[PDB]
Design a protein around this ligand. Structure first.
Ligand SMILES: Cc1cc(C)c(Nc2nc(Nc3ccc(C#N)cc3)nc(OCCCN3CCOCC3)n2)c(C)c1
Lengths: 552, 427
């Protein structure tokens, strides 16, 4: 079950040497159990006996499972693993089904011995040595090496895929129609050939592999297509998520909420409208696994909303490279967003959502822009192109924003979708001051110890007001002063503040926020007809500043 | 070509392993072009396929140099540079002429094709590994490593320097007034000649470099094209640190004299000898913003004196060759961008303003990309090294589209900003 494959040259970390650790206590009669395995492994050429010269022993274990007709034994290689070189990292992620192409037929092959079927570099085999100590008084024990890729070893995964890849080349080059995917000890073959030729071609492939010591089955699968692959469910004409269940409880531990938000995210790829706002807002802190977190009222509606969605099953269609790639985004109010990616009206390739937990003062158009960003990356990964976008925003509102925004922003070709809720600009500050409008010289101050402050204003009409504040900070009073001026002024108003901070929040034109005060101010700015906000140096200013600042 | 002297032994900084940088996902179109290019390079001995025992990686991108039809491979050697060139800026460094910035016209010539002859050190080849990625993780990437001096590597012109100074010498004798400078894959050739003769003299150099083996594909044909200006021909005489202009108005409103002045009070952090107080005495009445305020005697005396004081540059602002250069850029609207190059805050070594057009044919990312290249070329010509940008852009949208309008071969260090300023029209 081995093969004349070219081994891959392996080095140890430059200064290091082979692992010389051992195991003194034994497992009684479970020693000859390890003898039966080794001799049978030796005969198969997997391992080889050797005398205890220049040795680097590695601890050996043995373990049976429930009702084990055949025992299984393996060596812990963590120490050797710490000493061997780094390799080229194995497959990062997995192929997402939404980007697979349909075929008349597909096959799955499970390579047998896998690792033990590929030889190990000769000048490196000395380090994989291990012992089988017998009785007491240090009697000469049985010591072996490894001639093939050891099971737990650090280099086994990458060397195997390298071997497998090289071995498939004289067949892939004799079969351009057949496409083969590699993944772990698995092999996933597909073709548009008529089922007759395909069954023959699979058999040719098997015989190829078998002559290279790679065993593959004729009838193995305990379950036929659909394939229970990787949390997925792959049918001949559709794909979907391997069924998940949202468990019901009376008490919720952090771990259980950690599991729940994952099972929901994993479902969000096809099931539209999945939400994880308040369900994730519970795992903000302080983080402790066994700690019982009380389930909030809004978090219970969300879970109920998700349950109502997960109720009926939904599936996705595969990729047709010849047809357009469309993506459309919908807003979901509470800072969350959803999108669908499709080529066809009634079927989706996939769905998904945008988190958006950045900052404390955000904006609807910017959020949408981040969504287009997130999707463009996802599109470029799975299909290798960017989608035509269908967006709930007017071109006037987009144009106005990117022209006004301080960051550079780009957006691929996109068309307006009239379906509400629309993305608007709920207010725009004046660029120039307003003749005839009252001028509100505002200022707010506070004490960072007493936590007391004042928010007031003084106008050009000679009007003045000062309101006392508790539970507040200099940043809260700096905004309260602005809010106060809005309350007390007509439909057009010029406001002058001495706070970079305040002007910072307002000029960001947020339509929503996580501060009730900022939201109230927003409500006023929407209600006003014209508002001009102006900045002025705090300390050394006009003189209408310290009129309410020297009060604190 | 015949293997010359044995491969120059290349070592790294003590205890610095090779680059291990993930490979950005790419369009199908780009992977296709990357594939053709690489099987074509491999076919010419330039690169070879590697095994799982090579754990290193250096990113790759497909750009379009001529952008006409064919693509071009752009390896990003930023990481490997930091790990090798820091001892090849020391051991083999190319000296930077402080006169290049003073020439009337400077032309850039790509001589990147030169390196492809010279072999690279066998023991060092491993660290030059790159990966052509697969879409949707279908196949583990195609993995190559270099067998000849790679373009984009700073260590390549350092190894090629002797051979280059030899090829150039019989031209530098005929033309002793011309400053030639090799930064990476490019030569910077500057002459005080008039524009006509300067181009004719560049063509003499192109043909000189050619009859000694070196091609320079950047020229195309000067005979008969459609309307298209040259790719790169700078004029570093124009390059200074620009002064900041104050509004010139025939009358002043409270708001006008309150937005006062264009960075004043913060300009006191740049030009420290400024008094604003006798201008702050021009209101003090809780006035309507739109009300017009007349000039007083002491008000004009703190404006005219605070105007010619801004056209007299800062003193004590010198270049620190141990300190990195920092370039900040500000989007200004109307297809205009302002930037500053510095090392310590408010001590500007260089400031300028990029300008594309009125608009409606060029978007933000294109503008910023051209601006970053434009600034970087100034930094090369002036200090011999590139700055680290602080870009007004979301990280991922830059990391997605930067390679779209990128015509340069080197790549500066990025960084992304998140907080806007009130310093927009303060510049
Ligand atoms: C668990 C699993 C099983 C298999 C067989 C695969 N491979 C695989 N699956 C499909 N889809 C599919 C899956 C299951 C069923 C059923 N029943 C029907 C179709 N299409 C291709 O091959 C697509 C080849 C497209 N190209 C062709 C050449 O350019 C590169 C990509 N390969 C995969 C990815 C996972």
């Amino acid at each position: 079950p081995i093969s004349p494959i070219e081994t891959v040259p392996v080095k140890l970390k430059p200064g290091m040497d082979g692992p010389k650790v051992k195991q003194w206590p034994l497992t009684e009669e479970k020693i000859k159990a390890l003898v039966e395995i080794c001799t049978e492994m030796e005969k198969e050429g997997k391992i080889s006996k050797i005398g205890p010269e220049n040795p680097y022993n590695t601890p050996v274990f043995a373990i049976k499972k429930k009702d084990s007709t055949k025992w299984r034994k393996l060596v812990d290689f963590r120490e050797l693993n710490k000493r061997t070189q780094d390799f080229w990292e194995v497959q990062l992620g997995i192929p997402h089904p939404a980007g697979l192409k349909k075929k008349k037929s597909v096959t799955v092959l499970d390579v047998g011995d896998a690792y033990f079927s590929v030889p190990l570099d000769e000048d490196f085999r000395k380090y994989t040595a291990f012992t089988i100590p017998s009785i007491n008084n240090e009697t000469p024990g049985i010591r072996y090496q490894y001639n093939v890729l050891p099971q737990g070893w650090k280099g086994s995964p990458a060397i195997f895929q390298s071997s497998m890849t090289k071995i498939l080349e004289p067949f892939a080059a004799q079969n351009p129609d057949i496409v083969i995917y590699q993944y772990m000890d698995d092999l996933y073959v597909g073709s548009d050939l008529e089922i007759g030729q395909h069954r023959t071609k699979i058999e040719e492939l098997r015989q190829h592999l078998l002559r290279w010591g790679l065993t593959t089955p004729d009838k193995k699968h305990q379950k036929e297509p659909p394939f229970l692959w990787m949390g997925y469910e792959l049918h001949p004409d559709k794909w979907t998520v391997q069924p998940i269940v949202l468990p019901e409880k009376d008490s919720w531990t952090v771990n259980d909420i950690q599991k729940l938000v994952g099972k929901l995210n994993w479902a969000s790829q096809i099931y539209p409208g999945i939400k994880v706002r308040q369900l994730s807002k519970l795992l903000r802190g302080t983080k402790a696994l066994t700690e019982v977190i009380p389930l909030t009222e809004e978090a219970e509606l969300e879970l109920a909303e998700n349950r109502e969605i997960l109720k009926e099953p939904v599936h996705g269609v595969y990729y047709d490279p010849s047809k357009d790639l469309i993506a459309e985004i919908q807003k979901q109010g509470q800072g969350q967003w959803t999108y669908q990616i499709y080529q066809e009206p009634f079927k989706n390739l996939k769905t998904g959502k945008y988190a958006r937990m950045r900052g404390a003062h955000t904006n609807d158009v910017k959020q949408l822009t981040e969504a287009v960003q997130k999707i463009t990356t996802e599109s470029i990964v799975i299909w290798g192109k960017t989608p035509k976008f269908k967006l709930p925003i007017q071109k006037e509102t987009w144009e106005t924003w990117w022209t006004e925004y301080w960051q550079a922003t780009w957006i691929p070709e996109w068309e307006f979708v009239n379906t509400p809720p629309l993305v608007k600009l709920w207010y725009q500050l004046e660029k120039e001051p307003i003749v005839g409008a009252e001028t509100f010289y505002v200022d707010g101050a506070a004490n960072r110890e007493t936590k007391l402050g004042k928010a007031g204003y003084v106008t050009n009409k000679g009007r003045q007001k000062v309101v006392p504040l508790t539970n507040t900070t200099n940043q809260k009073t700096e905004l309260q002063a602005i809010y106060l001026a809005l309350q007390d002024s007509g439909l057009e108003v010029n406001i002058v503040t001495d706070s970079q901070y305040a002007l910072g929040i307002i000029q960001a034109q947020p339509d929503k926020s996580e501060s009730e005060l900022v939201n109230q101010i927003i409500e006023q700015l929407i209600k006003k007809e014209k508002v001009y906000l102006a900045w002025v140096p705090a300390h050394k200013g006009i003189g209408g500043n310290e009129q309410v600042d020297k009060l604190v | 070509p015949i293997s010359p002297i044995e491969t120059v032994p290349v070592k790294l900084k003590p205890g610095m392993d090779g680059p291990k940088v993930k490979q950005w996902p790419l369009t199908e179109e780009k992977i296709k072009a990357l594939v053709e290019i690489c099987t074509e390079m491999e076919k010419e001995g330039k690169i070879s396929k590697i095994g799982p025992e090579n754990p290193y990686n250096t990113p790759v991108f497909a750009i379009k140099k001529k952008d006409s039809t064919k693509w071009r491979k752009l390896v990003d050697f930023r990481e490997l540079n930091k790990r090798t060139q820091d001892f090849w800026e020391v051991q083999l460094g190319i000296p930077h002429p402080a006169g290049l910035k003073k020439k009337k016209s400077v032309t850039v010539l790509d001589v990147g094709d030169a390196y492809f002859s010279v072999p690279l050190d066998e023991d060092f080849r491993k660290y030059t590994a790159f990966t052509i990625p697969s879409i949707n993780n279908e196949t583990p990437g195609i993995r190559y490593q270099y067998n000849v001096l790679p373009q984009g590597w700073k260590g390549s012109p350092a190894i090629f320097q002797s051979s280059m100074t030899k090829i150039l010498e019989p031209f530098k004798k005929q033309n002793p007034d011309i400053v030639i400078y090799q930064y990476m894959d490019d030569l910077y050739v500057g002459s005080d000649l008039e524009i006509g003769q300067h181009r004719t003299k560049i063509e003499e150099l192109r043909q000189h470099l050619l009859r000694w083996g070196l091609t320079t594909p950047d020229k195309k044909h000067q005979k008969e094209p459609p309307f298209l200006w040259m790719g790169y021909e700078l004029h570093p005489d124009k390059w200074t640190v620009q002064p900041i202009v104050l509004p010139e108005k025939d009358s002043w409103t409270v708001n006008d004299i309150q937005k006062l002045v264009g960075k004043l009070n913060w300009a006191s952090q740049i030009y420290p000898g400024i008094k604003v107080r006798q201008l702050s005495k021009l209101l003090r009445g809780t006035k309507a913003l739109t009300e017009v305020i007349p000039l007083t005697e002491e008000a004009e005396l703190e404006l005219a004196e605070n105007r010619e004081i801004l056209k007299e540059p800062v003193h004590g602002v010198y270049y620190d060759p141990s300190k990195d250069l920092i370039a900040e850029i500000q989007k200004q609207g109307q297809g205009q961008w302002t930037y500053q190059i510095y090392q310590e805050p408010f001590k500007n070594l260089k400031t300028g303003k990029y300008a594309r057009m009125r608009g409606a044919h060029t978007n933000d990312v294109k503008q910023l990309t051209e601006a970053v290249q434009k600034i970087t070329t100034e930094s090369i010509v002036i200090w011999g090294k590139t700055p680290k940008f602080k870009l007004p852009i979301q990280k991922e949208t830059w990391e997605t589209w930067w390679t779209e309008y990128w015509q340069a071969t080197w790549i500066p260090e990025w960084e992304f900003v998140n907080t806007p300023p009130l310093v927009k029209l303060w510049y």
